[PDB]
Structure formats: C-alpha cells, structure tokens
Design a binder for this molecule. Structure first.
Ligand SMILES: COc1ccc(C[C@H]2SC(=S)NC2=O)c(OC)c1
Ligand SMILES: [Zn+2]
Length: 258
C-alpha cells in the first residue's frame, strides 16, 4: 500500500491495487440537489454524542484522526436511513490547498473548502474490522466546511496540530466534545457508497448534512501546515487529500427534507 494524493499515486491510480475503485457504489459523489428526492420513509436522525470519549489524535500520513473509545455504546448514530445502532470510532477531515476545493462530496458541482467525516460502525457486527466487510457496516456523517467565521468547537483540534505535524505522530486528545462540530440543522442527503480511500470498501451508508459549518481562514490554514511525510523527510504539505466525485451509476440520493 503506497497510495496517496499525488500525480503518481493518487486517485487515478488506486484501481490498480484496489479494482473496486471502479465499482458500482463508490464515493464520494456529486449531490444534484434538484434530482434528490424527499423520502418520507426516513425515520428521524439521532446523533447522541453526550457520552463520547475521545482518546487520541493521530497523523496517519493521509489525514489526522480523532479517535474515540468505541469499547461500548458511548457515542452513537441511529435513525434516518439506518437500522440499528452505529458507534462512533473516529473523525477526520479532507481539505484543499485553497478555499475553493477540499470536499469529497460536491453539491451541484460546488466544492467546499473541507469535509468532516464522523465514522460509525454497526454494532450488530461486533467490531469495526468485521463491519467494513458488510454492505451496511458503516455510517459516515459528512459535514461540509466553508470559510467565514471561526468554529469555536474546532479550535482545540486546530491547536494540537502543531504537535502532530508528521506521519506517525500522535498526541493525547481526551475530553473533546464532537457536538461542537455540528451545524444547527440535521437536514441531510443519504445514499449507499464506499470508503473514499483505499481499500475503497462498499460498506458505507452516507449521511451528508445539507448545512455547512463555518470555520475561519486561520483554522483551515493550520490544517494546511500538516505534512504527509514523516519526520525528517522532505516536506510535502498535507493538502488536497480528497478523492473526486465518482459515477453515481444505479443509485438514488434521498433527501430528509422537503
Ligand atoms: C479500512 O477501514 C477504513 C480505512 C480508511 C478509512 C478512512 C477513509 S474512509 C472515509 S469515508 N474517509 C477516509 O478518509 C476508513 O474510514 C476511516 C476506514
Ligand atoms: Zn473521510
């Protein structure tokens, strides 16, 4: 596994090692707001993060992950399109080199400056590694970021990034409340898709919030100071760590709202 985001190892190459890259339910996708259809069968969405227990932040050479204790049903996602209970395991972001790109999903071809992914696994499968092998194994809550006013609840993340500059560095990251990263509205679009990095497994129910959160230019500039490289290696800024939109194929995008 030597994949990344550059010319030589980026998204256009992934299919060689991971042929599912050209599969029937790949992510991300463009969300055509006019075509997406309100679905009255969707049950109310339930984001229950009050007992979330963050543990650590890790630069893995692709993004940074904020990791949670998922040894029990602390923070969970239910409802909406979902049957059963999905436990929060981690969140991370994808972002650009400039404010006009960075998101993975697009909205009528619009690219946001970044996209937050809150990753949850279906507890009926017992562990995350088993869940990723199932078509309904994961639920990813995707939230767009635009540049404007600062997001206060993001600043503790921003301020630890200096300590995890390079690939393989981690830091303690306890007591972080992911509720501070949500927008006011839980209106969403949903469709069946995949992981957006290798191994590209077709195991995700996507729930993409319609309302972006606002972050400041200063906050996102700090994301852009991270490195893809390890300590001591030539600097490669961690920017443009997004996969472009993939073919929708035989899928419909459903809206939770009228
Ligand atoms: C093997 O299981 C994996 C591997 C990689 C990722 C991260 C990808 S998938 C996504 S959506 N956005 C991302 O960056 C997973 O989600 C953590 C799950
Ligand atoms: Zn992601």
């Amino acid at each position: 596994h030597h994949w990344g985001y550059g010319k030589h190892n980026g998204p256009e190459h992934w299919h060689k090692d991971f042929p599912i890259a050209k599969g029937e339910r790949q992510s991300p996708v463009d969300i055509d707001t006019h075509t997406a259809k309100y679905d009255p069968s969707l049950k109310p969405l339930s984001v229950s993060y009050d007992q979330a227990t963050s543990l650590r932040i890790l630069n893995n050479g692709h993004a940074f992950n904020v990791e949670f204790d998922d040894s029990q049903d602390k923070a969970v996602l239910k409802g909406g399109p979902l049957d059963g209970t999905y436990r929060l395991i981690q969140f991370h972001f994808h972002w650009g080199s400039l404010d006009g790109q960075g998101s993975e999903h697009t909205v009528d071809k619009k690219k946001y400056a970044a996209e937050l992914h809150l990753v949850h696994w279906n507890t009926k499968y017992g562990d995350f590694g088993k869940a990723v092998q199932q078509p309904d194994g994961l639920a990813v809550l995707g939230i767009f970021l635009k540049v404007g006013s600062a997001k206060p609840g993001l600043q503790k993340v921003v301020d630890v990034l200096d300590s995890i500059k390079t690939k393989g560095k981690s830091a303690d990251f306890t007591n972080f409340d992911p509720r501070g990263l949500l927008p006011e509205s839980l209106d969403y679009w949903t469709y069946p898709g995949s992981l957006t990095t290798p191994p590209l497994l077709e195991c995700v129910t996507w729930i993409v919030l319609k309302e972006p959160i606002s972050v400041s230019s200063e906050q996102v500039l700090k994301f852009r100071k991270l490195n893809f490289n390890g300590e001591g290696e030539p600097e490669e800024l961690m920017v443009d760590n997004w996969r472009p939109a993939q073919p929708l194929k035989n899928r419909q995008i459903k809206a939770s709202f009228k």
